[PDB]
Each structure stands twice: as structure tokens, then as C-alpha cells.
Design a binder for these strands. Structure first.
Ligand SMILES: [K+]
Ligand SMILES: [K+]
Ligand SMILES: [K+]
Ligand SMILES: [Mg+2]
Ligand SMILES: [Mg+2]
Length: 51
RNA sequence: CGACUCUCGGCAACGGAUAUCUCGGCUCUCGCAUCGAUGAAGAACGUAGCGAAAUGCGAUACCUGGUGUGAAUUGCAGAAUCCGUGAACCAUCGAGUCUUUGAACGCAAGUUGCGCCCGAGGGGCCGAGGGCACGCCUGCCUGGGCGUCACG
């Protein structure tokens, strides 16, 4: 396919950027235990974000 | 005299009739002609400092932009703004955005399951982003058959 015009002309922007992936951290008592016991941060993340 | 039953009146209950209403209904008349593969109608999930629904909107998410008007919104709180490119849960619309779906279109489907191609940008690797259904029309490219021939 070598089209005579592009069907989409908008570049296409990454709407699932880092600010959508990392919404906010968890601050519950269980989540705070993970910080000093297992060097772990708990985050609320987007549903579309994989590991 | 007392209890019980029945009965008459006064006050208090129970219940929601009556009366007066009404941003609703019903009937009639008029004007207009505008949905969708440029993805509709419908369905799902999200979205507010405090929201569940209804209403609105779509990761730009009770809204962005333009224009108009011209000082509010308010249930609470905080911010912004005022002789101004300037408040508004204001009006209107030409600029935008518009998740998962659905005629629904890579293949499926009680699955966010199973594939292939291109590709900014940082040989290979990692990519943001995007393509790949069916029928049909015009043109085009690559082909098949001694089907009809011509010359070698
Ligand atoms: K009585
Ligand atoms: K009445
Ligand atoms: K399967
Ligand atoms: Mg509303
Ligand atoms: Mg489908």
C-alpha cells in the first residue's frame, strides 16, 4: 500500500504516558509496612498498564 | 355501689377522603426535513475537593476552545475574577478532544484470550503510533488455459 493521502493526519499522542500509568501511591497502614520491610512502593496504576 | 356489654356527647388517636392547587398528562392545529464504515442507534466502564442516582461529559472526562452577555456559583469549603481579553451549575456555536464496544471490520469470545505487517524515536533490541474483514465498481500490476488466431 502506497496511498495518495494519509487516512490519519494527526500524529497520534501517547495518552498512556507516565502520569496516567502512575496515578498516586497508596498510604494505608498495610502499604506503609512494605516500605521498610520489603523496599516496596505501592502505587495505584491504570488498568491498561502492564508490568 | 362497682365490673362487663351496648349506646349518646366532648377531647385525644388511627387513617388519608374532601377542598384549593399543578415546571405533568391528553387532544387539536402549524412549521421544518437533519442518522450511519468520516463508524450510527444501542450497550459497558469511567469521570467532581466533598456523589450514590438522575443530568452532563470521555484519560482535554459535570468539561477545553470561539463568540455573546456582563459579576456570579452556592449545600459546605477553598480558588479565580471586577472601569475587565472578564465571574457564571449563564447563553450560543463555527475550533478541539472523544475510553471498551456495537452494522463492527485480523481470528475469537462465560477469554480484556490467539495472530500477522509497517513503523517514528532511541545489525540487533526496545519502540510511541498505526494497519491487516466481506461484497462491489473504474483503472492498474502480476499471471493461467492450444479458448480464437498470426508469424516463425
Ligand atoms: K364516643
Ligand atoms: K384534591
Ligand atoms: K480460543
Ligand atoms: Mg449536571
Ligand atoms: Mg468485534
Amino acid at each position: 500500500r502506497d496511498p495518495k493521502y494519509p487516512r490519519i493526519s494527526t500524529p497520534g499522542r501517547n495518552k498512556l504516558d507516565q502520569y496516567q500509568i502512575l496515578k498516586y501511591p497508596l498510604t494505608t497502614e498495610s502499604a506503609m509496612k512494605k516500605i521498610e520491610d520489603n523496599n516496596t512502593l505501592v502505587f495505584i496504576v491504570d488498568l491498561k498498564a502492564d508490568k
